[PDB]
Design an enzyme around this catalytic site. Structure first.
Site, PDB file in Angstrom:
ATOM      1  N   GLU A  35      75.363   9.676  30.676  1.00 12.55           N
ATOM      2  CA  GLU A  35      74.539  10.612  31.337  1.00 12.55           C
ATOM      3  C   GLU A  35      74.187  10.122  32.739  1.00 12.55           C
ATOM      4  O   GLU A  35      74.192  10.906  33.698  1.00 12.55           O
ATOM      5  CB  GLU A  35      73.236  10.798  30.559  1.00 12.55           C
ATOM      6  CG  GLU A  35      73.452  11.638  29.260  1.00 12.55           C
ATOM      7  CD  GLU A  35      73.838  13.102  29.480  1.00 12.55           C
ATOM      8  OE1 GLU A  35      73.934  13.551  30.637  1.00 12.55           O
ATOM      9  OE2 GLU A  35      74.186  13.761  28.442  1.00 12.55           O
ATOM     10  N   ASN A  46      72.083  21.755  38.111  1.00 11.06           N
ATOM     11  CA  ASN A  46      72.966  22.624  37.321  1.00 11.06           C
ATOM     12  C   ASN A  46      73.143  23.982  37.942  1.00 11.06           C
ATOM     13  O   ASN A  46      72.366  24.400  38.776  1.00 11.06           O
ATOM     14  CB  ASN A  46      72.403  22.771  35.919  1.00 11.06           C
ATOM     15  CG  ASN A  46      72.123  21.439  35.244  1.00 11.06           C
ATOM     16  OD1 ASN A  46      71.005  21.173  34.784  1.00 11.06           O
ATOM     17  ND2 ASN A  46      73.151  20.632  35.117  1.00 11.06           N
ATOM     18  N   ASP A  48      72.687  26.836  36.842  1.00 15.56           N
ATOM     19  CA  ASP A  48      71.583  27.774  36.475  1.00 15.56           C
ATOM     20  C   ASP A  48      70.309  27.507  37.292  1.00 15.56           C
ATOM     21  O   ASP A  48      69.316  28.261  37.164  1.00 15.56           O
ATOM     22  CB  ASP A  48      71.287  27.823  34.948  1.00 15.56           C
ATOM     23  CG  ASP A  48      70.617  26.570  34.412  1.00 15.56           C
ATOM     24  OD1 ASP A  48      70.360  25.621  35.192  1.00 15.56           O
ATOM     25  OD2 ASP A  48      70.397  26.448  33.195  1.00 15.56           O
ATOM     26  N   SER A  50      68.536  24.786  37.179  1.00 15.51           N
ATOM     27  CA  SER A  50      67.734  23.697  36.617  1.00 15.51           C
ATOM     28  C   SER A  50      68.289  22.363  37.104  1.00 15.51           C
ATOM     29  O   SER A  50      69.342  22.317  37.772  1.00 15.51           O
ATOM     30  CB  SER A  50      67.760  23.786  35.086  1.00 15.51           C
ATOM     31  OG  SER A  50      69.070  23.488  34.643  1.00 15.51           O
ATOM     32  N   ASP A  52      68.768  18.040  35.975  1.00 12.74           N
ATOM     33  CA  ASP A  52      68.672  16.958  34.996  1.00 12.74           C
ATOM     34  C   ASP A  52      68.147  15.666  35.621  1.00 12.74           C
ATOM     35  O   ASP A  52      68.497  15.336  36.764  1.00 12.74           O
ATOM     36  CB  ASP A  52      70.063  16.630  34.418  1.00 12.74           C
ATOM     37  CG  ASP A  52      70.714  17.823  33.776  1.00 12.74           C
ATOM     38  OD1 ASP A  52      70.037  18.631  33.115  1.00 12.74           O
ATOM     39  OD2 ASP A  52      71.935  17.951  33.952  1.00 12.74           O
ATOM     40  N   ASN A  59      66.515  17.944  31.080  1.00 18.68           N
ATOM     41  CA  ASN A  59      66.651  19.122  31.939  1.00 18.68           C
ATOM     42  C   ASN A  59      65.331  19.854  32.105  1.00 18.68           C
ATOM     43  O   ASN A  59      64.512  19.921  31.196  1.00 18.68           O
ATOM     44  CB  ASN A  59      67.707  20.021  31.285  1.00 18.68           C
ATOM     45  CG  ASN A  59      67.963  21.253  32.057  1.00 18.68           C
ATOM     46  OD1 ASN A  59      67.497  22.295  31.692  1.00 18.68           O
ATOM     47  ND2 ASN A  59      68.727  21.137  33.117  1.00 18.68           N
ATOM     48  N   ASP A 101      64.562  18.559  17.862  1.00 19.80           N
ATOM     49  CA  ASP A 101      64.449  20.017  18.146  1.00 19.80           C
ATOM     50  C   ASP A 101      65.369  20.853  17.231  1.00 19.80           C
ATOM     51  O   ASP A 101      65.149  22.066  17.072  1.00 19.80           O
ATOM     52  CB  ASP A 101      64.739  20.247  19.649  1.00 19.80           C
ATOM     53  CG  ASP A 101      64.670  21.699  20.095  1.00 19.80           C
ATOM     54  OD1 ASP A 101      63.568  22.274  20.111  1.00 19.80           O
ATOM     55  OD2 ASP A 101      65.725  22.216  20.527  1.00 19.80           O
TER      56      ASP A 101
END
Ligand SMILES: [Cl-]
Ligand SMILES: [Cl-]
Ligand SMILES: [Cl-]
Ligand SMILES: [Cl-]
Ligand SMILES: [Cl-]
Ligand SMILES: [Cl-]
Ligand SMILES: [Cl-]
Ligand code: NA
Length: 129
Positions: A35, A46, A48, A50, A52, A59, A101
């Site tokens: 990562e 990203n 979209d 967002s 990280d 994120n 989650d």
């Protein structure tokens, strides 16, 4: 801060990730390698909109607040900047919520594609732990 491989394994163990939700330490070290290449200050935007953040590339769409991700949540209740600290506490505490989650470590796409199923114990081999 750019961690050493064994240095990060020791930090992650101290912070309670080893076998957290049944994922062995090598899983967490592997995910951090791909990562962020173990760099706490890593960021990546990203498509979209967002971003990280940090050693485990957490994120802003769901997990932290950066002020610039419309419609997003902050389920870890932290500024995303907290995830870039030399001290990995915020990243670990948030990662424990993320891995709880429902989809386990599949939440980390680099873990699924580069670590899952591999000999992850290689990532802690050698280390005084
Ligand atoms: Cl390495
Ligand atoms: Cl392991
Ligand atoms: Cl936002
Ligand atoms: Cl901006
Ligand atoms: Cl929220
Ligand atoms: Cl905030
Ligand atoms: Cl799981
Ligand atoms: Na957010």
């Amino acid at each position: 801060k750019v961690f050493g491989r064994c240095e990060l394994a020791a930090a992650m163990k101290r912070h309670g990730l080893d076998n957290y939700r049944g994922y062995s330490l090598g899983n967490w070290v592997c995910a951090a390698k791909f990562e962020s290449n173990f760099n706490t200050q890593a960021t990546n935007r990203n498509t979209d909109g967002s971003t990280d953040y940090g050693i485990l590339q957490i994120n802003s769409r769901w997990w932290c607040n950066d002020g610039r991700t419309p419609g997003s949540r902050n389920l870890c209740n932290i500024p995303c900047s907290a995830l870039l600290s030399s001290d990995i506490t915020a990243s670990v505490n948030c990662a424990k919520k993320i891995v709880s989650d429902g989809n386990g470590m599949n939440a980390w796409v680099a873990w699924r594609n580069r670590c899952k199923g591999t000999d992850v114990q290689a990532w802690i081999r050698g280390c005084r732990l």
